[PDB]
Design a protein around this ligand. Structure first.
Ligand SMILES: CC(C)C[C@H](NC(=O)[C@@H](O)[C@H](N)Cc1ccccc1)C(=O)O
Ligand SMILES: Fc1ccc2[nH]ccc2c1
Ligand SMILES: [Yb+3]
Ligand SMILES: [Yb+3]
Ligand SMILES: [Yb+3]
Ligand SMILES: [Zn+2]
Length: 607
C-alpha cells in the first residue's frame, strides 16, 4: 500500500502503457495534450478507477470514443488531487481498456521548470526540463503515481521547430508538425516497462556529440565540448556495470547536461541520464555521479522499490555498485576511501536530524510526509553501510557481488519491499544463516541513529586528510606560520575535498585560522564545486565576512540542492549575512526550480 499515492493501487488495476501526445507552449508555460492509458483491471466487476493529478486542468476523458463522467476530489496538499473516473462498462479480471485523457498543466507544475532565454547559455531560446522523482509525475499527466506499477510508453511531442525534444526513451525520428509548420514533432519509444517516476522530458536548443558506442552527450552548444571530455569514462563504466549487474537492457545510454538550476547531481532517467553542469570540473574528478546513475540501470530501474518507504533498496544498492565501478577503475583502496567518506556524510545527516529522528531510520514510514521534505543521505549511506557490513560478514566483495548479480536477475522488472530483499538474502546465503542471525535486523532496518556496527575501512588514502585536518584544528596562533602551499603537494582533488569535510565537521575554527588557510592554500581560486562548496561553508560558519558575496554567488548561479540549501541556511545563521540571504532568496524565488524554491523557503523560515 503506497501512502504517497491517491490512485487505485496495483491490486485493483495496473497501467501497462502510456501513449502521450502533447504540445509545449513557451508563451503560456503549459503542456497541453492527451495521455492514453492502457489499463488492465485486477478485479471482478470493476466500475471506476482513481488516478493521481496535481494542478492539472482536465478537459475531458474518452473511452470507446465517448466523453465519460469523472471528478476531482479535494486537494490533499503535496499529494495533489485524486481523479475518479467512471467506467462506461464494468470490466472483468484481466480485461484491458484504453482511457484517453485531455489535459493541460499549470505553469506552477512542481515537475517542471520553464526557463527564460536569459536563464540559458545561448540567450536566444527558452528551455524546459522535468523532474518526476519522487511523486511529481502527477504534476505532468494523470497517472497511477506509484512505483508499484510499471508501464511502457511512446510519445509524440510538438515543439517550436528551432528547438529539440528528448525523453527517457529511444528517440524514434522527427518531422514537421502537419498541424503547424512553425513546429516539429519528435517521437519516442520506451519498450521496457518502467515506474512512472522515470518519465522525463527536456525541450531546448540542444546539440549532441558522440562519446562512445552507445552514448551521445547533449547540452547547449556552449557546454558540449567540455562535457564530452568530462564524461569520457562513461563507456568504460558501462562495461564494468554490465559485468556486475548483467546485460544492459535499455539500448542507448546518453547524457544530458542541464542548465545550472537542475536540482540534483544526477537523475537516472532511462536512456538519458540527467546531470548538473556543476559536474564539469575540468578533470573528470566528479565522475562517480555518472557511475552512480549508470548503476540505476540495474538497481532502481530494473529492480524497483515498491513504495518510497523502501527507497533505500534503490539508493543503497546503487551506491554499492557505484563504489565497485570506482574501485575497479581506480583500485580497491579508492573504493575504501569513498566508502569511509560516505560514513562521514552519514554522521553529518544524523547529527543534523538528531539521533532519534524518524527520518534517520533506514526504512521510513512516509504517511503524511512529503518525500521532498524527508530526503537526505540517510537511505544512501546507511543503506550502503548495511551492504558493506554484510559484505565483510559473508566473505568479501566477490562473494557479495554474486548475490548482487543474482538479486537483479531475480527481481528484474518487478517492484519489491525490504522484506522481499531480506528473504532472498536468506535464501541465497542458506549456508550462512547462522551468521545472518547475528545481524541486529531490527536496529539496522527500523531504529533511528547511526548503525549499530561500523564496518572495516582501509585508511591508506584517508590518513593524510585526517592528519592535515588535525594539524589545523589543534594549531594555535603561533602554529599558523608553519602551514605552506606544499602541504597540499601530494593530495588528489578527492583528498583535498576530504580534508575540508573533516575540517568542516569541527566548524567553527578561529577566523585567524581560516584567513591563513586562504593565504597559503588559495582555496578561493579552486573551481571544483565539491571543494568550493565545503570551503565556502567552513568560511561562513567561521564567520568570515569576505566569504559572504562568494557564498551568495554560488548559491544562486547554480541550484543543485546539495549546495544551494546549506549555503542559504549557513548564510542565514551568520548574523552579518542573515538579511542578505533572506533578501536574495526573495529576489530569486520566482525564477527558481519550484521544489528548490519551496525547500529553501522552509529552511529560511520564509513566507
Ligand atoms: C552519486 C549520487 C549520490 C548522486 C545523487 N543522485 C542520485 O542520488 C540520483 O540517482 C537520485 N535518483 C536523485 C533523486 C532522488 C530522489 C528524488 C529526486 C531525485 C545526487 O547528488 O543528485
Ligand atoms: F523520498 C524519500 C524516499 C525514501 C526515503 N527514505 C528515507 C527518506 C526518504 C525520502
Ligand atoms: Yb522507427
Ligand atoms: Yb525466508
Ligand atoms: Yb605554541
Ligand atoms: Zn541514486
Amino acid at each position: 500500500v503506497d501512502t504517497c499515492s491517491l490512485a487505485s493501487p496495483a491490486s485493483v488495476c495496473r497501467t501497462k502503457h502510456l501513449h502521450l501526445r502533447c504540445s509545449v507552449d513557451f508563451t503560456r508555460r503549459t503542456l497541453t495534450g492527451t495521455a492514453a492509458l492502457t489499463v488492465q483491471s485486477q478485479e471482478d466487476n470493476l466500475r471506476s478507477l482513481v488516478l493521481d493529478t496535481k494542478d492539472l486542468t482536465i478537459e475531458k476523458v474518452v473511452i470507446n470514443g465517448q466523453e465519460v463522467k469523472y471528478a476531482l476530489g479535494e486537494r490533499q496538499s503535496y499529494k495533489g488531487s485524486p481523479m475518479e473516473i467512471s467506467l462506461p462498462i464494468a470490466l472483468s479480471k484481466n480485461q484491458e481498456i484504453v482511457i484517453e485523457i485531455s489535459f493541460e498543466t499549470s505553469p506552477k507544475s512542481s515537475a517542471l521548470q520553464w526557463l527564460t532565454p536569459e536563464q540559458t547559455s545561448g540567450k536566444e531560446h527558452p528551455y524546459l526540463f522535468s523532474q518526476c522523482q519522487a511523486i511529481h509525475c502527477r504534476a505532468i499527466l494523470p497517472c497511477q503515481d506509484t512505483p508499484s506499477v510499471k508501464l511502457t510508453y511512446t510519445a509524440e511531442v510538438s515543439v517550436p521547430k528551432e528547438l529539440v525534444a528528448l525523453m527517457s526513451a529511444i528517440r524514434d525520428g522527427e518531422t514537421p508538425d502537419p498541424e503547424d509548420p512553425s513546429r516539429k514533432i519528435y517521437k519516442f519509444i520506451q519498450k521496457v516497462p518502467i515506474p512512472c517516476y522515470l518519465i522525463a522530458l527536456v525541450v531546448g536548443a540542444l546539440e549532441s556529440r558522440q562519446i562512445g558506442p552507445r552514448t551521445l552527450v547533449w547540452s547547449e552548444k556552449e557546454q558540449v565540448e567540455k562535457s564530452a571530455y568530462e564524461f569520457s569514462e562513461t563507456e568504460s563504466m558501462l562495461k564494468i556495470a554490465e559485468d556486475l549487474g548483467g546485460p544492459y537492457v535499455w539500448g542507448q545510454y546518453d547524457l544530458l547536461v542541464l542548465p545550472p538550476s537542475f536540482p540534483y547531481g544526477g537523475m537516472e532517467n532511462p536512456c538519458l541520464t540527467f546531470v548538473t553542469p556543476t559536474l564539469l570540473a575540468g578533470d573528470k574528478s566528479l565522475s562517480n555521479v555518472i557511475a552512480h546513475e549508470i548503476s540505476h540501470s540495474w538497481t532502481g530501474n530494473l529492480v524497483t522499490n515498491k513504495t518510497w518507504d523502501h527507497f533505500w533498496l534503490n539508493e543503497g544498492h546503487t551506491v554499492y555498485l557505484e563504489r565497485h565501478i570506482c574501485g575497479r577503475l581506480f583500485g580497491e583502496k579508492f573504493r575504501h576511501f569513498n566508502a569511509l567518506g560516505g560514513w562521514g556524510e552519514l554522521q553529518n545527516s544524523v547529527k543534523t536530524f538528531g539521533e532519534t529522528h524518524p527520518f534517520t531510520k533506514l526504512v521510513v514510514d512516509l504517511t503524511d510526509i512529503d518525500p521532498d521534505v524527508a530526503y537526505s543521505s540517510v537511505p544512501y549511506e546507511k543503506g550502503f553501510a548495511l551492504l558493506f557490513y554484510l559484505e565483510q560478514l559473508l566473505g568479501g566483495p566477490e562473494i557479495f557481488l554474486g548475490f548482487l548479480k543474482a538479486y537483479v536477475e531475480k527481481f528484474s522488472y518487478k517492484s519489491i519491499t525490504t522484506d522481499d530483499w531480506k528473504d532472498f538474502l536468506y535464501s541465497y546465503f542458506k549456508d550462512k544463516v547462522d551468521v545472518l542471525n547475528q545481524v541486529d535486523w531490527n536496529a539496522w532496518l527500523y531504529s533511528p541513529g547511526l548503525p549499530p556496527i561500523k564496518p572495516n575501512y582501509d585508511m591508506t588514502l584517508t590518513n593524510a586528510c585526517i592528519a592535515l585536518s588535525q594539524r589545523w584544528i589543534t594549531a594555535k596562533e603561533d602554529d599558523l606560520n608553519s602551514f605552506n602551499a606544499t602541504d597540499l603537494k601530494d593530495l588528489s582533488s578527492h583528498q583535498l575535498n576530504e580534508f575540508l569535510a573533516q575540517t568542516l565537521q569541527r566548524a567553527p575554527l578561529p577566523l585567524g585560522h581560516i584567513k591563513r588557510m586562504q593565504e597559503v592554500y588559495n582555496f578561493n581560486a579552486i573551481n571544483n564545486s565539491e571543494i568550493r562548496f565545503r570551503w565556502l561553508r567552513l568560511c561562513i560558519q567561521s564567520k568570515w565576512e569576505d566569504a559572504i558575496p562568494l557564498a551568495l554567488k554560488m548559491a544562486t548561479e547554480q541550484g543543485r540542492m546539495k549546495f544551494t540549501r546549506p549555503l542559504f541556511k549557513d548564510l542565514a545563521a551568520f548574523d552579518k549575512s542573515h538579511d542578505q540571504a533572506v533578501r536574495t532568496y526573495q529576489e530569486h524565488k520566482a525564477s527558481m526550480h519550484p521544489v528548490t524554491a519551496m525547500l529553501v523557503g522552509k529552511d529560511l523560515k520564509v513566507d
